[PDB]
């Protein structure tokens, strides 16, 4: 009665592009070209696929299958599998809030850059502005110029002193106050995601049509543009030059594993929610396969889109694209690439489509990012929730805005690094390992192959059973152990993070998954009788 069965998706292509749009984001565009260039060049293509075939694809497919089979949220699905691990469904929620605290602000920057890209003369071309210093030296000026340790470029000046305004803060210690411009930008973004989420999967399935197809068009325009630029072969050479001695280093394998894990994004509850709304007899294998393989291919061509332009930039300057692509962060897009676009014909066009591309790269992923949590909460508190969806979605968008006010400060970029590298990563990897173990070693892999055999009509191959049993948990275990054994020393804009930053990162990191052990203790302490009977009634799913 009343609700009973849940709703279903409006078309196969909508869900196929929704998952693709969530999988593809900023990092696919710029993190993969950098990590591919600095870790063996073209030879990075070899371990990147292995970590996919053995690690990424099995987690992606197993998550999309569990989601499309059980049709439950990230929280209520554990009550029907392993109640003690229900805290997982909560942990991810908290995790999402941290991601949403910064991932949108980044887009805000692009948005503030987009609304600043409608002028006939781009603001970051000249030095006669209200934010430039006396060190600002630009081009279209007297030739012979020689760069100095204190000299700066109008683009670097525009990012540093105008939009980001990071010169007004001394670090994590002093970062206040808040920039109202980026607050309004992130409000507009939280509004464009509000009207794209508030109705449920109908609008995020209609809006995804645009958010997921535009980046390929923009990447195509930038691609055929950058291929025509003189001296673009240098960036391609630096992008594909095989350096097989890097493969001897045990670091590049960990870099590839981590990169393909985030980029694929299993273990977050997004694929669970997206798979939940679908036909029971609908095929899941082909969907997961195609989407992931596209997500990789798209990264691969994005590499060219970036390195052709950076090759042209190295030609205009003096070569060694590694020198011009030293900084691995937002500065590679907001300063370097932007300065390269400004020196091209129809600069307004390629700027509008570039920043618009960035925003459209981000939107689909935060759409999903919220979609998983909303689905989880609505499925965990039914009839206490779902009274309206707009109320909860609004409470989340607003919560993310107040959670992003720390990032909208002058030293907000500092917090972005802190949140992006020390907090979300190791916790998502941790909960992904816990989930992979619970589904593989608690619920039983044989019964899982039986559920896929019921849904798809055939039992999964031995390659996948042997992947879920041993290969995938060791795949996540390797990354977690590698990170925990040596957290990277953070540095951003000639500013090294204090030594206690990692403690703050761990505090944010630890505060996310306090619920899974405290919930195991909660259910283990609430259910009467012996601990063996409590863990037996707590590990085995509900019989009816």
């Amino acid at each position, epitope marked *: 009665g009343s609700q009973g069965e849940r709703e279903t998706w409006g078309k196969k292509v909508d869900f196929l592009l929704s998952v693709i749009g969530y999988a593809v984001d900023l990092g696919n565009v710029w993190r993969f070209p950098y990590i591919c260039a600095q870790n063996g060049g073209g030879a990075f293509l070899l371990p990147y696929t292995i970590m996919a075939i053995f690690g990424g694809i099995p987690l992606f497919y197993m998550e999309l299958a569990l989601g499309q089979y059980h049709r439950n949220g990230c929280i209520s699905i554990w009550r029907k599998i392993c109640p003690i691990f229900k805290g997982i469904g909560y942990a991810i929620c908290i995790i999402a809030f941290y991601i949403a605290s910064y991932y949108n602000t980044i887009m805000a920057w692009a948005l503030y850059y987009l609304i600043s890209s409608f002028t006939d003369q781009l603001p970051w071309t000249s030095c006669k502005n209200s934010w430039n210093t006396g060190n600002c030296t630009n081009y279209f000026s007297e030739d012979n110029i020689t*760069w*100095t*340790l204190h*000299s700066t470029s109008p683009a670097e000046e525009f990012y540093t002193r105008h939009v980001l305004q990071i010169h007004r803060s001394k670090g994590l210690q002093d970062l206040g106050g808040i920039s109202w411009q980026l607050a309004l930008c992130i409000m507009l973004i939280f509004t464009v995601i509000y009207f794209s989420i508030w109705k449920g999967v109908k609008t995020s399935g209609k809006v995804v049509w645009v958010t997921a197809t535009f980046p390929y068009i923009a990447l195509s325009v930038l691609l055929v543009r950058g291929a025509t630029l003189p001296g673009a072969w240098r960036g391609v050479l630096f992008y594909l030059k095989p350096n097989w001695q890097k493969l001897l280093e045990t670091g590049v394998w960990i870099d590839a594993a981590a990169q393909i894990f985030f980029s694929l994004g299993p273990g977050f509850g997004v694929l669970l929610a997206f798979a939940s709304y679908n036909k029971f007899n609908n095929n899941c294998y082909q969907d997961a396969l195609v989407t992931s393989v596209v997500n990789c291919m798209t990264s691969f061509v994005s590499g060219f889109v970036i390195f052709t332009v950076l090759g042209y930039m190295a030609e205009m300057r*003096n*070569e*060694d694209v590694s020198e011009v692509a030293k900084d691995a962060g937002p500065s590679l897009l907001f300063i370097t690439y932007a300065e390269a676009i400004a020196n091209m014909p129809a600069s307004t066009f390629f700027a509008i489509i570039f920043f618009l591309m960035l925003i459209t790269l981000g939107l689909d992923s935060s759409f999903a990012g919220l979609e998983g949590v909303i689905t989880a909460v609505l499925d965990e508190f039914p009839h206490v929730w779902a009274k309206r969806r707009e109320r909860f979605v609004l409470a989340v968008v607003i919560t993310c805005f107040f959670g992003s006010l720390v990032t909208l400060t002058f030293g907000g970029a500092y917090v972005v690094k802190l949140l992006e590298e020390y907090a979300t990563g190791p916790a998502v990897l941790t909960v992904a390992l816990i989930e992979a173990v619970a589904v593989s070693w608690f619920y039983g892999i044989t019964q899982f192959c039986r559920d896929v055999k019921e849904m798809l009509g055939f039992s999964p191959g031995w390659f996948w059973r042997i992947c879920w049993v041993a290969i995938s948990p060791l795949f996540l275990l390797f990354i977690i152990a590698s990170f925990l054994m040596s957290p990277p020393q953070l540095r951003l804009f000639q500013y090294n993070y204090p030594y206690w930053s990692i403690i703050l990162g761990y505090a944010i990191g630890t505060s996310s998954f306090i619920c899974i052990p405290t919930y195991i203790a909660y259910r283990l302490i609430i259910t009467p009788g012996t601990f063996k009977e409590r863990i037996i009634k707590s590990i085995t799913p509900e019989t009816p």
Partner: antibody
Amino acid sequence: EVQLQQSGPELVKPGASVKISCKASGYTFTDYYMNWVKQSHGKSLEWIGNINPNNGGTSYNQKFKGKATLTVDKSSTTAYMELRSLTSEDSAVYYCTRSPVRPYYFDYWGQGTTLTVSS
Amino acid sequence: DIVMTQSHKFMSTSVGDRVSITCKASQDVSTAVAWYQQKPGQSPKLLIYSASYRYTGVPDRFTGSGSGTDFTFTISSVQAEDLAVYYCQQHYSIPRTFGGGTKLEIKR
């Protein structure tokens, strides 16, 4: 004008260490990278590494990693290079030369330091 | 790394003749080549930077040409005080390497 005055010649026994100074004048010391070029007897020039005077931002060569240590002092605008584990190959003339960030040319050099590693 | 190869270790010329020294690089360099002059007993002195551009305080008789991998340093009127060892050096990729050196001996 722009003058880079190094230290005098040094005769040191093999296995010891030696430090060479580089007093700069005639320009804004905090504006340019400070470099060190090794020139062997009858050989070509060999860039050892540079250092950023503002914070001591060193950048050595893979061939000199663990061989040379570059330091800098802003209070007196003077650079230093220390060499440990001295052998017969280190007996050469060392220069310290000023250089901008881009284009990376060596506009002004020091007079040189004749190093002799022998017992 | 980059290998700056000066094939001619020694070159003979006369006072007033046109002399040109060649410099061969490993990979493509665009226009990132500097020419230094080291007189016997003195420190190297920068003459050319970025292939063709002359530095301040350098006579007009010293020129530079080339665009790619092979570069040429040209002296129009050789003087008696031009007797020195000439070095070429790339300034694009880390590390910065030098050439073998061409001791320009004067024939009379």
